[PDB]
């Protein structure tokens, strides 16, 4: 509980959060493709504190030793600081409320003239403070069930824990240096492989990432193999049933269902509207994907409640939810004050389903390491926009979309650190203090960082440097969302309801049979991840499982303790390169070559 | 001497030679890019004879065991049969004598109307028989000096010998199965890597072979890294001084000399004529390349003669040269009968320099595994065309170009098998019998195979399927060659003479210093190989030396006996795939995808 919270750690976390906020914010306001930087934060937290201790030792100043528990605290505090930068919708949703996006959207029903709000320090900071801490309190009951009871493996959380453990190991065990040397060989190889790939991804859909390994026809169906060691490494430490389910979901959606649905491009949905829109082939993608997750997610949530209810019938869990209710009512009486377009009971509905929605995202992140939190926000934005008419509907959808996205996204990304703390033997009490401190600085720094960018430069211009494409894209969903569920394509609800029931049946089927049949049951929400992303992620995960399957047969003993080290090195090596790659995009240094693939034209 | 020459081996070699002639001839008359198929012949010779013995055992017929010595005989006899198909200039030079190429070349000085000859069984077979056996007799004195005295490593000969040895090993030694399993792991990996590469080389200069590893600017200077395991594997078993010399030659020519010469595209040589022509930047490439080889080649040839002359002064070698003189005078009194355009003393000059020219090619092939025999023919074609005026000059250049090319190319490719026989403990006496028998069938089958293609189809049409581009290209060199050395670009002879002297000085310098300085002297004709081919071959060879250098430091003991096995597997794996790739081109099955690289346009 103590010896892990230090003043130097607070300074280090504050600095790491500040630069990582600037990197995230600048990328968000220029391209909207914010990268994952959690792994890089662990390395920077390690280097900064070891450098400070050595520099003081050089000057003769003695300092307390820097252990792995303190490294986890600094990394966790730093991550929470810059997570608010993109979880708060500064480049997607909150920027969609400005006047510039209102004019670009044009004149249409729902887009009434009173649907713009201007950014400011006073209201952005208060908006974040009220709602950011809501997700933190939900984590405490979720930490027990997911991290250790359900034994969910968080591949990025597990990889970071091994990386942090390898930094602070000092005693010469016989298996330790076999692991450390194995980690270092593949860490350098993966980092150099990612560095080599960068020079050839200099165009739209070209490079080693867009490699048509099984042909150009299968590549267009997203059934290729990108040379991503993050997904290959993640699949190595995931169970085979998770990897098989991921591929099985990609086959059903991209190999069968989407081609069959696309044959009705003129009947079921209009063909003039572009794809990736909620009226054309993306309503199928978004609603079927959540229905698979929600159908599986609800049953486990009811099962936990049902088990808990029976246990107390037979006879700090309520402390966290009491604080959550206190923060819930605080947002209920504050958010409508800032936005008169948002009614009081809109916030109430958002805060009741958030523990239930946050659980599903955390469970899904604990299976496939994919955070779908921003996908929940898109559905909630569409639904909440339909709960209001043309008047006060666009702002209501955007504001309520930020609420659902934050409590869902924050919960899943911050379960990554609890898995890291579990493996590094860090006290959960000290973790939550770093959770609150990191979130508190994030709710202060990010509004300040955004407005410095906002005042100095011009963000939102379609023809310019600081272009925020997702500010207008998120605005259009709310404009499309003011109309009810009628705008969804034909049979969209019927198919979604069928997949909701099908997901529930698998959850029923898995838990009712004996274990010697129950391990062949595919996981419904591991299936749902490739419904939105392509099947390349599924192929990469299965390749990682194939490597472990072959390795175990060849050498059972070595694969027992070397698979986690090799898999973590592959994840960390690609994760570390994400930091220099972001700096290159920060300085506008584009790749020189574009590796295109053509049909022998 | 016996137990290696068998009737079943003769039948197997005759069959393997016949199909390989058809594959070579069809590719020669359609694209002119004849591939290397020596490695594949060893595998097919092994499978055919093992299949025959097992099939007879299944039917109850008992047969003599099939040893590795018999496998070397069959492979050597088969190789000599189909080597004549492309060494005889059936698709480049002999096809340039037909009337179709004469009309396509147009009306120009030197291209007199009496400069066409039509193909036929009677004269093609007699032309080959007179001159093909000339190179065989020169091999006997060359076998002693090059294979074992000079200890030249023939990477394709060494790789084939290890492949043949691994086929016929039966006793469970402790290091044998470590070598066999190491060979098989990299043989399958290299073969599958070559198979994977094929689907993406579906265009002009696109694919993994044309990979700009160091940028597009360096790729245009041929300073990239093609993913060729043949050159990487060849460089592994070559000494470091050979690999370093190869890179050092590529730096001088492509990195320095060619860019400097190209700055005078309007002054030194005319700019209207295209490159790769003897009047524009290719006279520099061709004449400087030979001058480096000839300067080094002459000194070693004089050194052997000087050493031999001193030895006999102090006091079967002459049997081979007595037979060579007998075959030399036979061609002198026969070739001018077929071609009245060729004078008797043209053949005499060709047959005197052929042992001296053949030695240099065999020495160069024993260093870098690159056969430059067809490059000698281009120089001899140009020179002999200049020895005659506009009258009887084009045919004289073409016919004399075939003579010089055959005795030079045959000598170098057939020293590959003598290195194979040396490592497989095959009797040299039985090797020469397979040399003569294989050449005798080659001089019969190839004229017959060519005319069956010639009579049935239409070869030589620029707009058609059976197009022979090199038939017209070789015709144009003779047309350009009737004019003397004045057509060469400015300072072409001066620079060539400077490199001839510079090559000689290194040969002087290497043999005069003590050995503890003599190992740093670059080899002049290992430098000359990247003067015509790009520097990618140099980079691949140096990467192979880097792998061996790192492997030796990490584990001295294992790298001692596993480097030849791994290197041979890389060469054999790419060599084996050359057979199915040729069948795909035989059936006109083109690669589906073309992996292009663009400057981020
Ligand atoms: C033993 C293991 C390592 C096997 C290797 C994987 C194969 C199963 C893959 C690798 C390359 C793949 C091929 C790569 C490219 C194509 C081109 C594709 O043709 C196209 O449609 C390209 C575009 C066009 O031609 O219009 C058809 C599938 C095919 C043959 C793929 C079939 C499956 C292949 C052979
Ligand atoms: C074992 C691990 C490492 C993954 C290997 C998977 C591939 C070898 C196979 C398995 C699933 C196959 C896919 C299954 C389904 C389809 C759907 C099919 O889609 C269509 O029918 C086209 C629809 C249209 O016309 O739009 C094309 C082949 C493809 C992509 C197949 C291509 C090859 C895949 C990716
Ligand atoms: C530790 C080892 C493995 C180092 C890895 C090799 C590097 C030394 C190579 C690999 C990629 C190479 C780069 C690949 C591509 C380019 C693009 C090239 O720019 C171009 O001219 C492309 C065409 C254009 O932009 O017009 C400049 C060199 C550079 C940076 C190359 C510089 C050298 C690099 C970094
Ligand atoms: C260590 C082994 C594995 C090989 C690694 C070699 C590369 C790292 C280096 C060594 C030689 C270098 C080349 C040396 C000379 C040149 C010549 C230079 O040519 C020009 O000046 C351009 C002339 C023009 O404008 O036409 C461009 C850089 C280049 C290709 C360099 C690119 C990078 C190379 C290939
Ligand atoms: O939101 C989006 O769809 C895109 C890409 C998806 N986001 C990028 C990484 C995190 C993810 C997310 O949001 O969780 N981001 C728009 C700008 C910014 O990321 C934001 O959301 O404000
Ligand atoms: O000769 C050439 O320049 C080209 C490519 C080079 N030849 C192909 C492989 C062997 C090499 C050689 O000839 O030794 N071949 C033209 C047709 C045929 O190969 C022939 O030469 O009759
Ligand atoms: Fe986003
Ligand atoms: Fe040729």
Residue numbers in the entry:
A (entry chain A), B (entry chain B): 45 to 359, 393 to 678
Text taken from the publication that reported this structure:
Poaceae species use a unique chelation strategy, whereby plants secrete a high-affinity metal chelator, known as phytosiderophores (mugineic acids), and reabsorb the iron-phytosiderophore complex by the yellow stripe 1/yellow stripe 1-like (YS1/YSL) transporter for efficient uptake of iron from the soil. HvYS1 comprises two distinct domains: a substrate-binding YS core and a scaffold domain, implicating an elevator-like transport.
To overcome these limitations of DMA, proline 2’-deoxymugineic acid (PDMA), a DMA analog, was synthesized by replacing the four-membered azetidine ring with a five-membered ring. PDMA effectively substituted DMA for iron uptake by HvYS1 in the insect-cell assay system, and significantly improved the growth of rice in calcareous soil. In order to verify if PDMA functions in YS1 in the same manner as DMA, we determined the cryo-EM structure of HvYS1 in complex with Fe(III)–PDMA to an overall resolution of 2.9 Å. Fe(III)–PDMA occupies the same binding site as Fe(III)–DMA, demonstrating that PDMA can function as a potent fertilizer in an essentially identical manner to DMA. The carboxyl and amino group moieties of PDMA are recognized by YS1 in the same manner as those of DMA.
